[PDB]
Design an enzyme around this catalytic site. Structure first.
Site, PDB file in Angstrom:
ATOM      1  CG  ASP B  25      -2.012   0.880   1.055  1.00  0.00           C
ATOM      2  OD1 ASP B  25      -1.943   1.957   0.886  1.00  0.00           O
ATOM      3  OD2 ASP B  25      -3.010   0.408   1.575  1.00  0.00           O
ATOM      4  CB  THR B  26       1.955   3.622  -2.864  1.00  0.00           C
ATOM      5  OG1 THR B  26       0.908   3.558  -3.458  1.00  0.00           O
ATOM      6  CG2 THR B  26       2.900   2.593  -3.106  1.00  0.00           C
ATOM      7  N   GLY B  27      -0.199   4.113  -0.200  1.00  0.00           N
ATOM      8  CA  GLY B  27      -1.108   5.083   0.160  1.00  0.00           C
ATOM      9  C   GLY B  27      -0.898   5.056   1.664  1.00  0.00           C
TER      10      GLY B  27
HETATM   11  O1  LIG Z   1      -7.704   3.060   5.208  1.00  0.00           O
HETATM   12  S1  LIG Z   1      -7.014   2.051   5.363  1.00  0.00           S
HETATM   13  O2  LIG Z   1      -7.018   0.765   6.198  1.00  0.00           O
HETATM   14  C1  LIG Z   1      -5.132   2.339   5.885  1.00  0.00           C
HETATM   15  C2  LIG Z   1      -4.462   1.313   6.127  1.00  0.00           C
HETATM   16  C3  LIG Z   1      -2.906   1.527   6.716  1.00  0.00           C
HETATM   17  C4  LIG Z   1      -2.629   3.119   6.859  1.00  0.00           C
HETATM   18  C5  LIG Z   1      -3.361   3.997   6.677  1.00  0.00           C
HETATM   19  C6  LIG Z   1      -4.621   3.750   6.205  1.00  0.00           C
HETATM   20 CL1  LIG Z   1      -5.720   5.323   5.794  1.00  0.00          CL
HETATM   21  N1  LIG Z   1      -6.269   1.518   3.853  1.00  0.00           N
HETATM   22  C7  LIG Z   1      -6.273   0.077   3.384  1.00  0.00           C
HETATM   23  C8  LIG Z   1      -7.536  -0.750   2.945  1.00  0.00           C
HETATM   24  C9  LIG Z   1      -8.782  -0.189   3.293  1.00  0.00           C
HETATM   25  C10 LIG Z   1      -9.721  -1.081   2.954  1.00  0.00           C
HETATM   26  C11 LIG Z   1      -9.684  -2.261   1.977  1.00  0.00           C
HETATM   27  C12 LIG Z   1      -8.326  -2.658   1.537  1.00  0.00           C
HETATM   28  C13 LIG Z   1      -7.075  -1.701   2.017  1.00  0.00           C
HETATM   29  C14 LIG Z   1      -6.134   2.550   2.813  1.00  0.00           C
HETATM   30  C15 LIG Z   1      -4.753   2.715   2.296  1.00  0.00           C
HETATM   31  N2  LIG Z   1      -4.609   2.582   1.083  1.00  0.00           N
HETATM   32  C16 LIG Z   1      -6.099   2.121   0.338  1.00  0.00           C
HETATM   33  C17 LIG Z   1      -7.057   2.673   1.361  1.00  0.00           C
HETATM   34  N3  LIG Z   1      -8.067   3.686   1.167  1.00  0.00           N
HETATM   35  C18 LIG Z   1      -7.236   5.100   0.562  1.00  0.00           C
HETATM   36  C19 LIG Z   1      -6.821   5.747   1.874  1.00  0.00           C
HETATM   37  C20 LIG Z   1      -7.536   6.480   2.768  1.00  0.00           C
HETATM   38  C21 LIG Z   1      -7.094   7.372   3.568  1.00  0.00           C
HETATM   39  C22 LIG Z   1      -5.721   7.897   3.742  1.00  0.00           C
HETATM   40  C23 LIG Z   1      -4.708   7.308   2.633  1.00  0.00           C
HETATM   41  C24 LIG Z   1      -5.257   6.433   1.858  1.00  0.00           C
HETATM   42  S2  LIG Z   1      -9.376   3.831   1.455  1.00  0.00           S
HETATM   43  O3  LIG Z   1     -10.044   5.112   1.133  1.00  0.00           O
HETATM   44  O4  LIG Z   1      -9.541   3.173   2.789  1.00  0.00           O
HETATM   45  C25 LIG Z   1     -10.406   2.588   0.560  1.00  0.00           C
HETATM   46  C26 LIG Z   1     -10.915   1.269   0.968  1.00  0.00           C
HETATM   47  C27 LIG Z   1     -11.702   0.480  -0.036  1.00  0.00           C
HETATM   48  C28 LIG Z   1     -11.796   0.714  -1.361  1.00  0.00           C
HETATM   49  C29 LIG Z   1     -11.172   1.876  -2.013  1.00  0.00           C
HETATM   50  C30 LIG Z   1     -10.366   2.657  -1.213  1.00  0.00           C
HETATM   51 CL2  LIG Z   1      -9.611   4.399  -1.809  1.00  0.00          CL
END
Ligand SMILES: O=S(=O)(c1ccccc1Cl)N(Cc1ccccc1)[C@H]1CNC[C@@H]1N(Cc1ccccc1)S(=O)(=O)c1ccccc1Cl
Ligand SMILES: [Cl-]
Ligand SMILES: [Cl-]
Ligand SMILES: [Cl-]
EC number: 3.4.23.16
Lengths: 99, 99
Positions: B25-27
């Protein structure tokens, strides 16, 4: 270009005639932008993760430009804390992870 | 290697001698894993997600292997939707985005 991960991978995008800053997110299945107006029809959807879920509006076939690269795809609009470019659009510009 | 984004970038990691599936996860600024047992003391940390902030446990200097690459760094433990390898470790293994 080759983007380092020492810092958040923030890039400029152009959508709806507007220029915004967005995070290239490989962990995101979808593209989510902060509240804004978009053309066409939409349907409600819920996305969630750390912190819980938020409700957003789903717009399909939206034109967007990431770093000069034009792409089309679904865009979700809602109360997200940061603009996110997900895998659905990252693939269209030929973005890949490398190590 | 080079990893496309047509499907979730799920890889195999090793921690505490156990294999697990994780998402590149680069985010994510940090690495967050599902509830598990880790050695040493932990400190509190607040991480922001799509739905808000939550409190997780922070373990420093933890050995972990991602796709065969060895790394030693900070690992957060909490209620994550999936195991996540964030930028802090993506940098250790020399990961970058390219298009
Ligand atoms: O929010 S997390 O749990 C997180 C994990 C670790 C560190 C920081 C954060 Cl914010 N996450 C992972 C995730 C969530 C749900 C399903 C699969 C993986 C982030 C990280 N990147 C993808 C995810 N998102 C984007 C994001 C939100 C907030 C800040 C940065 C990036 S999202 O919106 O939850 C999202 C969930 C489902 C579908 C599309 C999107 Cl786009
Ligand atoms: Cl799409
Ligand atoms: Cl491809
Ligand atoms: Cl670290």
């Amino acid at each position: 270009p080759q983007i380092t991960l020492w810092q958040r991978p923030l890039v400029t995008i152009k959508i709806g005639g507007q220029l915004k800053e967005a995070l290239l997110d490989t962990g995101a299945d979808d593209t989510v932008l902060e509240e804004m107006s978009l053309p066409g029809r939409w349907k409600p959807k819920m996305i969630g993760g750390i912190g819980g879920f938020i409700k957003v509006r789903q717009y399909d076939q939206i034109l967007i430009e990431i770093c000069g690269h034009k792409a089309i795809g679904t865009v979700l609009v809602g109360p997200t804390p940061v603009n996110i470019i997900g895998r659905n659009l990252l693939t269209q510009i030929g973005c890949t992870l490398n190590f």
